[PDB]
């Protein structure tokens, strides 16, 4: 019993990050094989960040530019390539460490673990989600820029986000492990901002069914609803439309707990509605929604406490 | 910027968790050196529980009852011996992945990261605090018995938990490294349930200091109080009393933001009187104290966001 937001154990994700240095700027790198990957304004000055040129920055850096340090180690470049707002490095040694891994570009809503990291260590590990915004909610000081976000799928590491920067409202923004920015984000300083965010309908979902298969069923009513309906209620609270995929993504926690999609939506409905009268679901007094139907699979029992 | 539960980095932990089978039990087993820790309770059977004799139920095992797995490999017992709660399997192979380690016994208020482990394989990692009760509010299914809380200081894993068992509420109970229960729990199927809580001040507290530390003051007033005075609005609301230890400990805090703590006690004061305001802290819409004045000199800026 019991809910948490867990991450995914970090260790195979520990043993592949490092430390890259171009003139004054350091920030974290990660080591897969014989390559480093890191946020490409690594070789951006105090000056350059306002409108750099990247293709013009990189042209003028030489493979000794670059300094690469894996713990104690120091890893000789013997290459260099821009791909989109990542750089590769190569590097004269592969890493005995890398795992098994993938690089996925994941969907808004999804949810992964971020391996906090300071001077190429390991600091820290929280579950995030990411935002229908394209940002995230993260814990970043200054020097975290090419930590890392990740799932882990038996023994295979996918990464799926690299931390870039901060927005003025404090949340972050990065990119997948091909460099392509999650959101409209750039990386150079100017006005951009997060757009407005929604709340992520289907994880609302499944988490209250985690809620019921941990034996919790206050908030359940006698009542149905048709999708359109729902999602009059849903444009209301600034909720995400619910879909029929997202409803046919419901099938295994709906025969699980014996509750129809539509009928936990007009449960949902009427929590938006009436609000949750002092009372807690799994612990909290809000609608959680950083945590997916595979989150939920993943850590509740497969057998409900009827 | 942001603030969230975080974990440390797993890595050195689970290179140390093993599996152990006596009979028809597995859970799980810590692997430091030659030795491998675990639950007393793995030699007990489908009705022992209800009201075994450790000592009778042990001196009837021999070294080759039980059955230890790390990864795939098999590790042979040498040796065994009771410590309190535990059974301490000798083995004939050193862990080579052995980190440097201490076991401490944690104070209730206080944090740690536990590995969630199923058959000696690390499933997921999340932060706890020990509540005032000596419980924590874990997430744990069958089979998660012999996974261990801790703490990491620079290359150092202090071991502070190992699960033991789930009580009638939910939340979690279990020993030290030493095998001593945190709290009165025994290791048997009795009626034992946990104690009333109460909040953890203190880190309520640190709390509203990483909110300010963070930017956010709009819960201040011009208000201070005296101890006693905030005590006796603390018990009304089921806090623990502050105590002139705990204003001690929030002095760094303290000298940081250039916030008395009395005054931050006034503000508690009125938050706890008045309410919120359908307004949050830190994202969160209540008060939290799963945070110590660690965690947040921890994951704060050392610089505040005046
Ligand atoms: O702490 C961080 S994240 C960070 N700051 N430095 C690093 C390093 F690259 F790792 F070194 N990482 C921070 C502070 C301020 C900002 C910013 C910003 C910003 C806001 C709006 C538009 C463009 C840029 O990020
Ligand atoms: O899922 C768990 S924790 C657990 N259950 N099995 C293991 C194993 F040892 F790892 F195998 N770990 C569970 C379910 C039910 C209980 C219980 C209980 C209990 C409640 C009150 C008094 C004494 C015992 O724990």
């Given at each position: 019993?019991?809910?948490?937001?867990?991450?995914?154990?970090?260790?195979?994700?520990?043993?592949?990050?490092?430390?890259?240095?171009?003139?004054?700027?350091?920030?974290?790198?990660?080591?897969?094989?014989?390559?480093?990957?890191?946020?490409?304004?690594?070789?951006?000055?105090?000056?350059?960040?306002?409108?750099?040129?990247?293709?013009?920055?990189?042209?003028?850096?030489?493979?000794?530019?670059?300094?690469?340090?894996?713990?104690?180690?120091?890893?000789?470049?013997?290459?260099?390539?821009?791909?989109?707002?990542?750089?590769?490095?190569?590097?004269?040694?592969?890493?005995?460490?890398?795992?098994?891994?993938?690089?996925?570009?994941?969907?808004?809503?999804?949810?992964?673990?971020?391996?906090?990291?300071?001077?190429?260590?390991?600091?820290?590990?929280?579950?995030?989600?990411?935002?229908p915004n394209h940002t995230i909610k993260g814990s970043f000081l200054n020097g975290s820029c090419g930590s890392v976000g990740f799932?882990?799928?038996?023994?295979?590491?996918?990464?799926?986000?690299?931390?870039?920067?901060?927005?003025?409202?404090?949340?972050?923004?990065?990119?997948?492990?091909?460099?392509?920015?999650?959101?409209?984000?750039?990386?150079?300083?100017?006005?951009?901002?997060?757009?407005?965010?929604?709340?992520?309908?289907?994880?609302?979902?499944?988490?209250?069914?985690?809620?019921?298969?941990?034996?919790?069923?206050?908030?359940?009513?006698?009542?149905?609803?048709?999708?359109?309906?729902?999602?009059?209620?849903?444009?209301?609270?600034?909720?995400?439309?619910?879909?029929?995929?997202?409803?046919?993504?419901?099938?295994?926690?709906?025969?699980?707990?014996?509750?129809?999609?539509?009928?936990?939506?007009?449960?949902?409905?009427?929590?938006?509605?009436?609000?949750?009268?002092?009372?807690?679901?799994?612990?909290?007094?809000?609608?959680?929604?950083?945590?997916?139907?595979?989150?939920?699979?993943?850590?509740?029992?497969?057998?409900?406490?009827?």
């Amino acid at each position: 019993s019991g809910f948490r937001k867990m991450a995914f154990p970090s260790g195979k994700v520990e043993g592949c990050m490092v430390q890259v240095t171009c003139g004054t700027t350091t920030l974290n790198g990660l080591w897969l094989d014989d390559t480093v990957y890191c946020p490409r304004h690594v070789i951006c000055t105090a000056e350059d960040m306002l409108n750099p040129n990247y293709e013009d920055l990189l042209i003028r850096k030489s493979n000794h530019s670059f300094l690469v340090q894996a713990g104690n180690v120091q890893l000789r470049v013997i290459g260099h390539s821009m791909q989109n707002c990542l750089l590769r490095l190569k590097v004269d040694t592969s890493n005995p460490k890398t795992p098994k891994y993938k690089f996925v570009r994941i969907q808004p809503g999804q949810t992964f673990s971020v391996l906090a990291c300071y001077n190429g260590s390991p600091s820290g590990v929280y579950q995030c989600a990411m935002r229908p915004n394209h940002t995230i909610k993260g814990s970043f000081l200054n020097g975290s820029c090419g930590s890392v976000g990740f799932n882990i799928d038996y023994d295979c590491v996918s990464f799926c986000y690299m931390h870039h920067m901060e927005l003025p409202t404090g949340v972050h923004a990065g990119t997948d492990l091909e460099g392509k920015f999650y959101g409209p984000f750039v990386d150079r300083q100017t006005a951009q901002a997060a757009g407005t965010d929604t709340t992520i309908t289907l994880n609302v979902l499944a988490w209250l069914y985690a809620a019921v298969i941990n034996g919790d069923r206050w908030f359940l009513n006698r009542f149905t609803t048709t999708l359109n309906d729902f999602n009059l209620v849903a444009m209301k609270y600034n909720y995400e439309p619910l879909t029929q995929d997202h409803v046919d993504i419901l099938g295994p926690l709906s025969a699980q707990t014996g509750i129809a999609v539509l009928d936990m939506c007009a449960a949902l409905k009427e929590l938006l509605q009436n609000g949750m009268n002092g009372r807690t679901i799994l612990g909290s007094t809000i609608l959680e929604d950083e945590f997916t139907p595979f989150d939920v699979v993943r850590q509740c029992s497969g057998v409900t406490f009827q």
